[PDB]
Design a protein around this ligand. Structure first.
Ligand SMILES: C[C@@H](N)[C@H]1CC[C@H](C(=O)Nc2ccncc2)CC1
Ligand SMILES: C[C@@H](N)[C@H]1CC[C@H](C(=O)Nc2ccncc2)CC1
Lengths: 400, 398
């Protein structure tokens, strides 16, 4: 039908999940202009003409759409591999966010995943109190921008470095992690990188998972096929670590292993497979059957040691294989202060006391500054570097 | 402006039919980018290869859903030549009858000239004037631009002049309707530059509309336009436009009034005032119009008619219409008792076409055939971007 066709097309331009919504189309144009405006390419008439035709229009668009200078950078609160995280205030709305910058050139400089799509999808549509929310996503010729809710409570790395975590706390945080991971699993993902760095606390001291670049969609049988290992040396499971070209076929039990490493670290103060060098940790993980020991410290309860050992075993006998319910029923979690279904409504073990909305005391003081770093080299022919990041913008077609 | 304002200004832009960044135009850009990259030579680049692999499914569905050529049943070809052919079409679904104009992308590209269509699209789509042939839809594929216009069943003035020894009463009417049509174009801020019987079409009631605006240009601050470009059939072209061949000349709207004078002369005489066997011969006579413009020794043509023609066929500086259209309207030639300027298009036309059906094409000649094996673009070894000049052409009406 004629109407049907017009309508199907109209939805395809509206749907927040459509690859051709206003966001994707405005990105498509924005990318083209960026990838053509070069004197070497300007020699071609088609190109030179097209650019002069849209010059005024494209400049109007870039000013109207969400851009970097719309935000006032309050302070850098994280910096690393593919960019940095900075506490920002929107100059117009005065609202405070944590903005993440991803160097387009650096991700193209041999990453191998386009990992940012998973990160964008989950953070934007998860709609879960266990997932750091993504409000806006935009871009220019050089950086991807992710506008997330600010987690003023800092991460679990910071918490563990300031406290000798008692069991009561360990239980709470482990329990919130379990629910957070179960929410991710219910969405059809295996996180693959469960660690204190990815665990952030809100203004009330409650946990959320941040960063999901390592996430992968499960198949129908709830499995994932991967030839190359993914994760962090201390927290990676034996099966994900040994994942090879031979196959590399694993389930969500690999996440539960990392939770065991997390629990152990909170109560002991060290990772269960710490070694002199990185490669030593590898051997100890593979030899987990004999390398996993508890120090002579009569403060780790029986239940704690049990759960840790139930998690730090071979995938085949690992706790969590029969669903999250067998984990929740574990005696370690048995308490009289909270229930699973009401946990995130209870008072947290550490409720952060904040001075202002821009209080960054729970984050280490990072230098800030830089002086803009090297990006793409000026092309001599058409390369199309902005093409992989088309449709990343989350602004014109957001879900409400 | 507030965030809400900024957001909503941008969101209105995507729905504004007069926006270069409305949804339809943006789909063109993405549609085009897919065409000018889907070549094995360019597929060697990963950014390109991955891009096309992602939008493969999506782009195909889009192309099948949007307005396309096979949505129309071609009833009959009614015009040909230029960059394509004008054909009477019936929309397969709505059963509505339109006149569709095709423009070959390759042909346009081959000989530079690939920007004239923007003026034609803009005017026909937004003029919203009874003196302008209306443009309902505009779409495209990898090869042709498509313009869905209202069908003018009355035929053109060329056809009318070849069937009648046009009397003055008729000549006056048609000249008067042309004057109002040209004034409407001028009011929109354009100089037509190609006023001729071919571009003058009649509706079912026998009333005039201007069709084709591929030579129209936007007047500058002072209502002028510089230009360089070759010329086809100088018969109606003014001396100034002919002298301005290479950016060496700025001319006003009074170049259109010259063409009206040629039009009036042709209706009453039967021949164009500066006709010659060669193109350069016609040119020479137009340049020497001061001495070449003559009238036959049969005073069938009235005094007022001779006056108006001579008032139009003079040097730009003293040409009638330089002081506005009102001095033209007040000319004694137009003095009559059958119509008034403000009510003219509501009066009964001198020739009201009698039509058999909605697809009656009796006022249009049957056309030969093209035997036209239209040339296609060669497979590129690098990025050429032949689709870029046609991005943002797509247009729909509500
Ligand atoms: C170490 C990496 N895996 C990664 C963890 C999450 C971090 C972040 O978004 N932090 C953050 C989010 C919201 N509010 C404050 C900080 C970015 C870096
Ligand atoms: C010869 C050229 N200057 C040009 C004249 C007008 C013609 C046309 O659109 N004709 C038309 C319009 C509407 N209905 C029927 C025919 C296209 C070609």
């Amino acid at each position: 039908s004629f109407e049907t066709r017009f309508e199907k097309m109209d939805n395809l331009l509206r749907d927040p999940k459509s690859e051709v919504n206003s966001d994707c189309l405005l990105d498509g144009l924005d990318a083209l202009v960026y990838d053509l405006d070069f004197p070497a390419l300007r020699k071609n008439k088609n190109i030179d003409n097209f650019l002069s035709r849209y010059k005024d229009t494209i400049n109007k668009i870039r000013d109207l759409r969400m851009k970097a200078e719309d935000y006032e950078v309050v302070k850098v609160i994280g910096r690393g591999a593919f960019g940095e995280v900075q506490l920002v205030r929107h100059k117009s709305t005065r609202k405070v966010y944590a903005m993440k910058l991803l160097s387009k050139f650096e991700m193209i400089k041999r990453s191998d995943s386009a990992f940012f799509w998973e990160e964008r999808d989950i953070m934007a549509f998860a709609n879960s109190p266990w997932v750091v929310q993504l409000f806006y996503a935009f871009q220019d010729d050089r950086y991807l921008y992710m506008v997330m809710e600010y987690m003023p409570g800092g991460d679990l790395v910071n918490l563990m470095s300031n406290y000798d975590v008692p069991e009561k706390w360990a239980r709470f945080y482990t329990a919130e992690v379990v629910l957070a991971l179960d929410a991710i699993h219910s969405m059809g993902f295996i996180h693959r990188d469960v660690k204190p760095d990815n665990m952030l606390l809100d203004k009330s001291g409650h946990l959320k998972l941040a960063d999901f670049g390592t996430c992968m969609k499960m198949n129908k049988e709830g499995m994932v096929r991967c030839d190359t290992a993914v994760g962090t040396p201390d927290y990676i499971s034996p099966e994900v670590l040994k994942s090879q070209g031979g196959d590399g076929y694993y389930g969500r039990e690999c996440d539960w292993w990392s939770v065991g490493v997390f629990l152990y670290e909170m109560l002991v103060g060290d990772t269960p497979f710490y070694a002199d060098s990185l490669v030593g940790t590898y051997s100890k993980i593979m030899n987990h059957k004999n390398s996993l020991t508890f120090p002579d410290d009569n403060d780790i309860s029986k239940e704690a040691k049990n759960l840790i050992c139930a998690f730090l075993t071979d995938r085949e006998v690992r706790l969590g294989r029969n669903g999250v319910e067998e984990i929740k029923r574990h005696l370690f979690f048995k308490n009289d202060q909270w229930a699973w279904e009401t946990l995130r409504d209870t008072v947290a073990p550490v409720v952060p006391d904040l001075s202002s909305d821009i209080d960054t005391s729970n984050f280490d003081d990072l230098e800030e500054d830089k002086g803009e770093e090297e990006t793409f080299p000026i092309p001599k022919a058409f390369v199309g570097n902005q093409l992989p990041f088309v449709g990343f913008t989350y602004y014109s077609n957001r879900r409400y």
